[PDB]
Enzyme design. Structure first.
Site, mmCIF file in Angstrom:
data_model
loop_
_atom_site.group_PDB
_atom_site.id
_atom_site.type_symbol
_atom_site.label_atom_id
_atom_site.label_comp_id
_atom_site.label_asym_id
_atom_site.label_seq_id
_atom_site.Cartn_x
_atom_site.Cartn_y
_atom_site.Cartn_z
ATOM 1 N N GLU A 168 -7.061 4.390 -10.826
ATOM 2 C CA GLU A 168 -5.897 4.453 -11.227
ATOM 3 C C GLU A 168 -5.552 4.073 -12.761
ATOM 4 O OE1 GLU A 168 -3.641 5.525 -7.158
ATOM 5 O OE2 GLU A 168 -2.946 3.732 -8.428
ATOM 6 N N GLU A 309 -7.604 9.640 -3.084
ATOM 7 C CA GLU A 309 -6.430 9.031 -2.395
ATOM 8 C C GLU A 309 -5.338 9.903 -2.087
ATOM 9 O OE1 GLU A 309 -4.719 5.215 -3.895
ATOM 10 O OE2 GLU A 309 -6.427 4.489 -4.306
#
Length: 377
Positions: A168, A309
């Protein structure tokens, strides 16, 4: 070419496993879960205070998963870091093991079950996801050198498929400052110090020198550059690691047969996006939003795209719209053949998503799992 005899590669939008000796190729799908905790100050996958680690791997297998994404932090993968919070009565073969030995034990047992492992460098230090691949005290060269040492060690385990380079990439300020202030990731801005598309090439090259048989999984950023983000009405509303809108004009410069783009995507339990209101067209508006943020990377450009994810409470103590959200996303993944994924998370202890396990670390949420199972058949 490979220290295990196995070489992973992408051909078109499919991942293959090649036995280099026999010459046999098998397309593989990744029906994955994240099991996190190595990236936390526990320095070990969570739940070992309540379960035996092998029983957990068996249970994940029994549910038809064949892949695990394993977050780590720097100190988890160096010898000498001690895990915290394990019940050694349930885990006596872990007594006297450090964090690295436990990681090796888990990956080896996963491989014996045919489970592929994706390594994810998720935090530099065990406390929070930094927005860049470096901090004040820890340089890009340190980050790269850690990946090198990990690739040399784990490159010897046949079932390790490759490296999700940084969890991320994101921003900690708003545009316009997020594009220029040096504090967050960008893409196509042009500055190699903040442009994740450029850093992923630097980090990915260094890995492939020592683990040429691996795949390099590259996540999106949150914002890219003002021209790309302005070109779409929800351009400023992608997830951390979820904005692949700049891939088309700013592709990562890495070999096509090694590269996998790996967006994250979440529902109203993680953030009440404006597009989750029925007033803005929820849920029938969702296909075109996913398509723009990342889905075109596979459906228009033909790259391999693995959702790294996704997840949510599925109506158990969270926003009931999450049920509708997860159903629509699975319907859309099935329709469009996104067969490869890692669900967030196996662990129940994720505040805003829960996981496949309930809080007792033992029983699964049957309805949330039933929906997911549609991707596995």
């Amino acid at each position: 070419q490979t220290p295990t005899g196995i070489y992973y590669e992408v051909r078109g939008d499919t991942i293959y496993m090649i036995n280099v000796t026999s010459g046999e190729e098998t397309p593989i799908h990744l029906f994955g879960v994240n099991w996190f905790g190595f990236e936390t100050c526990n320095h070990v996958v969570h739940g070992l205070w309540k379960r035996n680690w092998e029983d957990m791997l068996l249970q994940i297998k029994s549910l038809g998963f064949n892949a695990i994404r394993l977050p780590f932090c720097t100190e988890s993968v160096k010898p000498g870091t001690q895990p915290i919070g394990i019940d050694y009565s349930k885990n006596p073969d872990l007594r006297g093991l450090d964090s690295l030995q436990i990681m090796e034990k888990i990956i080896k047992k996963a491989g014996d079950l045919g489970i592929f492992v994706l390594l994810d460098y998720h935090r530099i230090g065990c406390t929070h996801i930094e927005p860049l691949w470096y901090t004040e005290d820890f340089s890009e060269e340190d980050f790269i050198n850690t990946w090198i040492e990990v690739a040399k060690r784990f490159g010897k385990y046949w079932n390790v498929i490759g490296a999700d380079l940084k969890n991320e990439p994101h921003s900690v300020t708003s545009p316009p400052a997020a594009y220029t202030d040096g504090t967050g990731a960008t893409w196509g801005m042009g500055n190699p110090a903040t442009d994740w598309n450029l850093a992923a090439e630097r980090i990915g090259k260094a890995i492939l020198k020592v683990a040429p048989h691996w795949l390099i999984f590259v996540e999106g950023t949150q914002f890219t550059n003002p021209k790309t983000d302005s070109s779409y009405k929800w351009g400023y509303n992608a997830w951390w690691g979820g904005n692949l809108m700049a891939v088309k004009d700013y592709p990562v410069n890495l070999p096509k047969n090694k590269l996998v783009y790996s967006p994250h995507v979440y529902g109203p339990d993680v953030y009440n996006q404006p597009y989750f209101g029925p007033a803005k067209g929820f849920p029938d508006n969702l296909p075109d939003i996913w398509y723009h943020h990342f889905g075109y990377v596979k459906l228009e450009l033909g790259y391999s795209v693995v959702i790294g994810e996704f997840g949510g409470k599925y109506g158990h103590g969270g926003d009931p719209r999450d049920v509708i959200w997860q159903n629509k996303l699975v319907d859309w993944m099935i329709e469009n053949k996104f067969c490869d994924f890692f669900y967030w998370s196996w662990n129940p202890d994720s505040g805003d998503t829960g996981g496949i396990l309930q809080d007792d670390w033992t029983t699964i949420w049957e309805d949330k799992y039933n929906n997911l199972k549609r991707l596995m058949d």
